[PDB]
């Protein structure tokens, strides 16, 4: 039977498209756009339109949420298809809204929702179908009650749409096309994939695990900053697989009186036991099971021990999976981590720029944002926000945009009109205004993400580029050639040279090329855990680096400890040596299975402790020389990307005349020239505006604002006020140390 397939989520959001594989469509003699009849479980049928796809396999069929709900199936099921290309054009269709969706709308729904939806699509429908339409600020579901001819018809420009009558009652077969699901999560693809796999295995076919005889997981621990969407992940999994999600709240349990708390918890577990394969979610685990030293009373110990006993009391029976959410995975009692209890940990990190863009795309789906906003800019300027903050931002922007329309809906009625909703649009000004008075909550959090700097941003330095490519890319991209034949890859590279030559840029560039996470630990924080704080921080720094492998750990200004050590204090040298002991101790503890790369940068190479300079640690040395050749011209292009022009001030002459300068100096020159251009443009605008105050609109020839047109004079004036930061002594010291490194050893 080359008919049955497997259902999976689709990437196109239309309600009448299912994606096959080209070989399967070719075998079934079906062409693009041909109508099909899809039949699923419970003897429910629906009609749909097929299309082409890129990477879908032969046995997989892609469809969105509406079609899956209509067929009354779930993910991972099977369907039987049938090509039925004899659809007859319809004549009259009766469609009615559902009761619990149109509360306070009134108006005429046909002219607002149905007409744009049913135009130039020829959407096939079938009697009893349910479809969802996005409107002003809500999503309204419409149910087809009857058609002609029955039961298949195609909407055509000549039809008799009846949309009159009372709304119909929601039935008890379809759960809802409005609750959470896999299409309501963004920026967490990898972790969602892991959880989906690990929970789809037991919750679908328990008998397979019974017959095989392996041990399914009995506990999953999710940890991350608050407001990143953990409860939502658990709810989505439970509502998609099919279960009896039963939330338990930590403060609710602790708020009881003495002996009834553990009794309530016991009824919770026994109920979830005898209600079929279910998921138990414990929110705010640290609120009820903190570290032993934190507790001072006695009821806390009793509650913790009761939880542990009930956890150990689960042995097979119904496959009940326990999930728990905690803020930071060290306040939990260490007793709750042995095998047979919470053992598998999944991290839910703060989203990056793409994650924020996707969250904004998800949350503003109902709105009717005007064709002037740019979500990319708002996405990439809001670093430091979490999902909840972005949702609040969208809500506030909508509220602000609707505030300045009270005149149109003055009093009106308790049921707001319909066309006023379609009269509302949200512009960039509203989003910026909501941005202004908004405070994020991440801030002081380590950021892990793939840097966007590419190879062209760096000018010159070919040999260093090749050496980094050899040392980093080869051991990972072809691990077979390294497991065969016994080569031990290096664990670290140390950068040294004149200051401001682009060490951070090289590190970020190789991190981007390798497509690996990047973690930067800068000098100020390093000295912050040096004095005042303790050295326990390095432990979780290395742990976080290990968690997100592969990664490129970066230690900047490694010589700060020695620079502060040598002076007239002589009290904290112990702290510096503790920093070095921590770095060395967790540096040697790394294993070769994981790919963690350590890179250090410094500008006083002769002052670093010789303990680090040793096989098994940071051992290769790379010397980045002072810039030369028309690679500084490429540098100038790198920061002149966005800057408009240069006309006739030949940059090659500047490169010829500016020998012995680092990158920071050239970037300073470019910024100074741009500042002069801004000053000139602003003074010209002010001259024009104070001139227009005398002659009213006396402008025969129309000139717009002066287009950014940087001349040579600005650049020459900026160049006059320029010097060289690095003296001639430092380069000679560096070359002396290089020669000593070459000869002495």
């Amino acid at each position: 039977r080359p008919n049955r397939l497997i259902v999976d989520e689709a990437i196109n959001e239309d309600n009448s498209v299912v994606s096959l594989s080209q070989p399967k469509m070719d075998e079934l003699q079906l062409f693009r756009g041909d109508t099909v009849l899809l039949k699923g479980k419970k003897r429910r049928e629906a009609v749909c339109i097929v299309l082409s796809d890129d990477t879908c396999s032969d046995e997989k069929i892609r469809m969105n949420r509406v079609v899956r709900n209509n067929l009354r199936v779930r993910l991972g099921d099977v369907i039987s298809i049938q090509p039925c290309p004899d659809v007859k054009y319809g004549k009259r269709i009766h469609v009615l809204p559902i009761d619990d969706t149109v509360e306070g709308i009134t108006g005429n729904l046909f002219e607002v929702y149905l007409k744009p939806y049913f135009l130039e699509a020829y959407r096939p429908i079938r009697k009893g179908d349910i479809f969802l339409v996005r409107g002003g600020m809500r999503a309204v579901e419409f149910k087809v009650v009857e058609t002609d001819p029955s039961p298949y018809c195609i909407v055509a420009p000549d039809t008799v749409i009846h949309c009159e009558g009372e709304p119909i009652k929601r039935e008890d077969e379809e759960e809802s096309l409005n609750e959470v699901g896999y299409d309501d999560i963004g920026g967490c693809r990898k972790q969602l994939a892991q959880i989906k796999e690990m929970v789809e295995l037991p919750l679908r076919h328990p008998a397979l695990f019974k017959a095989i005889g392996v041990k399914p997981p009995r506990g999953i621990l999710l940890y991350g900053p608050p407001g990143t969407g953990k409860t939502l992940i658990a709810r989505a999994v439970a509502n998609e697989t099919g279960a009896f999600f039963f939330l338990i709240n930590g403060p609710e349990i602790m708020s009881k009186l003495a002996g009834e708390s553990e009794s309530n918890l016991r009824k919770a577990f026994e109920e979830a036991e005898k209600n079929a394969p279910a998921i138990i979610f414990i929110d705010e685990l640290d609120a009820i099971a903190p570290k032993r030293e934190k507790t001072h009373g006695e009821v806390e110990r009793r509650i913790v021990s009761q939880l542990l006993t009930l956890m150990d009391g689960l042995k097979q029976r119904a496959h009940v999976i326990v999930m728990a959410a905690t803020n930071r995975p060290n306040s939990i009692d260490p007793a709750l981590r042995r095998f047979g209890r919470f053992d598998r940990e999944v991290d839910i990190g703060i989203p990056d720029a793409t994650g924020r863009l996707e969250i904004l795309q998800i949350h503003t789906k109902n709105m009717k944002l005007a064709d002037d906003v740019d979500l990319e800019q708002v996405a990439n300027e809001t670093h430091g926000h979490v999902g909840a903050d972005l949702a609040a931002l969208c809500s506030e922007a909508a509220l602000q945009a609707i505030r300045k329309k009270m005149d149109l809906i003055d009093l009106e009625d308790e049921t707001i009109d319909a066309e006023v909703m379609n009269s509302l649009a949200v512009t960039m000004d509203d989003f910026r205004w909501a941005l202004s008075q908004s405070n994020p909550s991440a801030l002081r959090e380590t950021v892990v993400e793939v840097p966007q700097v590419t190879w062209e941003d760096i000018g010159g330095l070919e040999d260093v580029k090749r050496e980094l490519q050899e040392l980093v890319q080869y051991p990972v991209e072809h691990p077979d050639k390294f497991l065969k034949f016994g080569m031990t890859p290096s664990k670290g590279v140390l950068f040294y040279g004149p200051p401001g030559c682009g060490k951070t840029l090289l590190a970020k560039a190789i991190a981007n090329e390798c497509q690996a996470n990047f973690i930067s630990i800068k000098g100020p924080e390093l000295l912050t855990m040096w004095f005042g704080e303790s050295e326990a921080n390095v432990r979780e720094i290395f742990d976080k680096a290990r968690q997100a492998a592969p990664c490129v750990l970066f230690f900047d200004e490694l010589d700060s400890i020695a620079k502060a050590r040598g002076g007239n204090i002589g009290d904290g040298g112990g702290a510096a040596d503790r920093v070095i002991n921590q770095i060395l101790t967790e540096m040697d503890g790394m294993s070769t299975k994981k790919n963690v790369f350590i890179i250090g940068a410094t500008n006083r190479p002769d002052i670093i402790d010789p303990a680090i300079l040793r096989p098994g640690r940071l051992d290769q040395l790379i010397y980045i020389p002072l810039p030369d050749e028309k690679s500084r011209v490429a540098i100038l292009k790198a920061n002149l990307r966005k800057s408009p022009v240069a006309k006739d001030v030949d940059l090659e002459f500047l490169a010829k005349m500016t020998n012995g300068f680092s990158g920071a100096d050239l970037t300073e020159i470019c910024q100074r020239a741009c500042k002069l251009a801004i000053r000139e443009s602003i003074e010209s605008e002010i001259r024009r505006e104070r001139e227009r105050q005398t002659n009213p609109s006396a402008m025969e020839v129309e000139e717009d604002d002066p287009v950014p047109e940087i001349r040579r004079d600005h650049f020459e004036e900026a160049m006059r006020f320029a010097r060289r930061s690095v003296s001639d002594n430092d380069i000679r010291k560096y070359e002396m140390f290089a020669q000593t490194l070459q000869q002495s050893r």
Binding site: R92, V155, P157, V160, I161, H162, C163
Partner: protein, 225 residues
């Protein structure tokens, strides 16, 4: 805006007429225009004399007094509460079936009341329609303000105990239970137990008088472009 007006108007037609009659008859009966003796369904009078005066009024005239007002009001409330729910329950269309059920129950109850020596033909009919509604709407849990989660198919027995301990004349409630059970067996249980043809069938005369409501379309619009 008379709430009583549209409240009455929204009632289904046959329930509307029945409620109007069962409220209107007692008022005139207590006014004194017609003596109670004219309306009791006297068995020997009906058998010997044709007495076309009392084939119908036995279910409309009720001697309300300060000894049975609570029973009267609670029965009227039960009628109002469950007759409409049965009307909207699986009986939204084809009212002829409901009317035939009512008329058959009326004929059989009148015949058996002639067989016994009973007078007031209201309680058995109301309780029997409640019983058949509960039986067709079984397995669902519903109760009163203090009744937590009482299950269905038990209310008839509860009201039996109530009106037996508080009141009397349990014979007519018993015969209401039997007539409801036999009608359920004949209309529903028999055609699926043995597959026999429907012994009871609605004649086309009632369909002529009471056509079943079909799907209505109203007026719509052309999609155009």
């Amino acid at each position: 805006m008379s709430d009583i007006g549209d409240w009455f108007r929204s009632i289904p037609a046959i329930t509307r007429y029945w409620f109007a009659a069962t409220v209107a008859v007692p008022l005139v009966g207590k006014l004194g225009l017609i003596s109670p003796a004219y309306l009791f369904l006297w068995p020997e009078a009906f058998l010997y004399r044709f007495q076309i005066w009392r084939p119908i009024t036995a279910t409309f005239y009720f001697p309300v007094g300060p000894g049975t007002g609570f029973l009267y009001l609670v029965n009227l409330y039960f009628l109002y509460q469950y007759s409409t729910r049965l009307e909207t329950g699986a009986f939204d269309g084809r009212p002829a079936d409901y009317l035939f059920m009512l008329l058959f129950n009326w004929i059989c109850i009148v015949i058996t009341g002639l067989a016994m020596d009973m007078q007031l033909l209201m309680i058995p009919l109301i309780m029997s329609v409640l019983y058949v509604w509960a039986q067709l709407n079984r397995d669902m849990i519903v109760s009163f303000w203090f009744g937590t989660r009482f299950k269905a198919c038990y209310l008839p027995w509860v009201i039996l105990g109530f009106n037996y301990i508080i009141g009397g004349s349990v014979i007519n409630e018993l015969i209401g239970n039997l007539v409801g059970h036999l009608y359920f067996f004949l209309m529903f249980r028999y055609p699926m137990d043995l597959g026999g043809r429907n012994f009871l069938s609605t004649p086309q005369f009632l369909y002529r008088w009471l056509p079943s409501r079909r799907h209505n379309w109203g007026q719509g619009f052309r999609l155009g472009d």
